Design a protein around this ligand. Structure first.
Ligand SMILES: CC(C)(CN)Oc1cc(F)cc(F)c1
Length: 330
């Protein structure tokens, strides 16, 4: 089997991407944030505290003839941005882009933190990291990908995120029309439950490539590119008037600037992030200070290849017995 779904930016900055997902019988379609940095499929629901719902579409398990309570199961997750959610668990039929899993754990939110309530466009998350990170207790549950994998034509999914435009998540096949050149594959460590890999270095603009190992995660659920402070300083030193602002919480730059590109290494290959991808617009409405899309990972404990990096590539998440990542230009 295969599936193919369009993923759409939630706003003019590409702060996140939403993908329609069918849950239950008859289908209830929710727009989920596909997150390769976590492993829970959770939704706003008929159980969510009413004051914490503000415009989201909800899953109502009582209206699904295939929903079953997973008795005794609870979940509770905290994300790297400080957000959180928790609740109870149903199993139900979940379809993405024509690919159907029966008996998928659908984690129903009873509580969500304020940043979820405030994002009216995100109805929940669909985690695509390794199932070892799933938070369901006392019986850990599998991701949608792990449940689909044996049925898929090939045990892979691909992320093709757009810059200020829709893109695609495919399951079970490589679309050889969706990228240029060849796909470079690189090793993955699953020891922390992430799609963790080692970039071979970077360049700033038209500068020379610096060969250096950068361990980090491929994370579609993180907006920005978080790298070591040395690398990030080297980037923003090429932008007149850029500075790290403790009050704003990262590097800012004059909105009048034209930004240089950023290149990262994948083995001997190179992915170029155009400068405009690194502009996240005014820090507050009408400001002439703009927020940078490359930020320091120093306060995080891991480097994060988030959407700023991934949207410059066609990315293969290869779930073969020994997982690997693939990157192609596009
Ligand atoms: C949608 C927001 C950004 C709201 N707090 O929640 C996350 C957090 C994550 F770390 C990952 C993700 F995909 C969504």
């Amino acid at each position: 089997s295969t599936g193919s779904a369009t993923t759409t930016p939630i706003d003019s900055l590409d702060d996140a991407y939403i993908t329609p997902v069918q849950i239950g019988t008859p289908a209830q379609t929710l727009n989920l944030d596909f997150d390769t940095g976590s492993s829970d499929l959770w939704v706003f629901s008929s159980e969510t505290t009413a004051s914490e719902v503000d415009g989201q579409t909800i899953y109502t398990p009582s209206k699904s003839t295939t929903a079953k309570l997973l008795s005794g199961a609870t979940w509770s997750i905290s994300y790297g941005d400080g957000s959180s959610s928790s609740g109870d668990v149903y199993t139900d039929t979940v379809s993405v882009g024509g690919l159907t899993v029966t008996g998928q754990a659908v984690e129903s939110a009873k509580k969500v933190s304020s940043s979820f309530t405030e994002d009216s466009t995100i109805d929940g998350l669909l985690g695509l990291a390794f199932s070892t990170l799933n938070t369901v207790s006392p019986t850990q549950q599998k991701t949608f990908f792990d449940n689909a994998k044996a049925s898929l034509d090939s045990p892979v999914f691909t992320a093709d995120l757009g810059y200020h435009a829709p893109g695609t998540y495919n399951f079970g096949f490589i679309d050889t029309t969706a990228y240029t050149g060849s796909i470079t594959y690189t090793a993955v460590s699953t020891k922390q439950g992430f799609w963790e890999w080692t970039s071979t270095g970077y360049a700033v603009g038209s500068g020379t490539f610096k060969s250096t190992s950068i361990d980090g995660i491929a994370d579609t659920g993180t907006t920005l590119l978080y790298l070591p402070a040395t690398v990030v300083s080297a980037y923003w030193a090429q932008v007149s008037g850029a500075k790290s602002s403790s009050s704003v919480g990262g590097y800012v730059f004059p909105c009048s600037a034209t930004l240089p590109s950023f290149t990262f290494g994948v083995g001997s290959a190179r992915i170029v992030i155009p400068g405009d991808y690194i502009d996240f617009g005014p820090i507050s409405t009408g400001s002439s200070s703009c927020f940078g899309g490359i930020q320091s990972s120093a306060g995080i404990g891991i480097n994060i290849f988030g959407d700023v990096a991934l949207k410059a590539a066609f990315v293969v998440f290869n779930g073969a017995t020994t997982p690997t990542l693939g990157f192609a230009s596009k």
